[PDB]
């Protein structure tokens, strides 16, 4: 009797006895979950059996970081976001700068709407990349998917990828049958992924059956990479050496649309809706689930008192020093793919202009931008 006979058991206990102790937690979920909201949601379940305890588990197990906030919850299927919207909506509002339950998201994967980006100064921009994720409708997300679902996804993904030609022809590598020699090459290229080490991922149950049905695919030119069944059904990355962000984004769009077209011919669709855009496992990657970035050398303003305020105004974020930073868009939901990449292209050349002032010895006052 395939039945959530336990959720019914848990219901034999008063809500307060099952309520998690979140006293020292620093994540979006703990900030929103009240004993009242919990009692209201603990009886619900999505069509696939996903519950509120499943949504919040990773947030209960991981207190988080004293200064860095993490989301603390995951979706297990497309319906999760609707069935538990009373928990997800306020979290989405806080995590995505006021994005409200009534706002709409616009998708735009037309590379011709991107203004410049084909000439970022290579003397400062070492590399460029664009990555995103996708979920196939009808299948549960990684925290919840069964072995059958995972394998169906891999078969579907592999036959579509094997159909790509020309600039996008490549090969697939199943994790379980990968050789040491192949693994070495993948590591040297920075294309490899292994069983997650992050307890945030582990605590959600997404690592079950490792490495069954997990795989890596990339084209012969090594400019297009796809991960299958790791954190999301699909993770797609487009990159190359240099500052030609436009070519990277065009390949990204071209590769995405072809894969989507092949899936549609077989009657499969990516999880998507007008309000949250593309649906993925972690609420922080909703909308476009896109991260467009560059490895840029900014030794001078990297030490400036204003760098922090400039990034904020341009809507960029950093991470990685030796003067080399990883700069990418900070937004995910509420802007289209084109707009996000556009903000990285315009924001980067301004960033370069400010670095060239400091090289000379001139101040960077007249170059400060207005909050975008």
Task: Give keywords.
two-stranded antiparallel sheet; alpha+beta; 2 domains; 35% helix; 372 residues; Transferase Creatine Kinase, Chain A, domain 1; Creatine Kinase, Chain A, domain 2; monomer; eight-stranded antiparallel β-sheet; 13 helices
How would you explain this protein's 3D organization?
The structure is a monomer. This protein is α+β, with helices and mostly antiparallel strands. The chain is built from 13 helices and ten strands. The protein has two domains: 5-101, ATP:guanido phosphotransferase, N-terminal domain (Transferase Creatine Kinase, Chain A, domain 1, Orthogonal Bundle); 104-371, Creatine Kinase, Chain A, domain 2 (2-Layer Sandwich), CATH 3.30.590.10. It is 35% helix and 15% strand. Strands 2-3-4-5-1-8-10-9 form an eight-stranded antiparallel β-sheet.
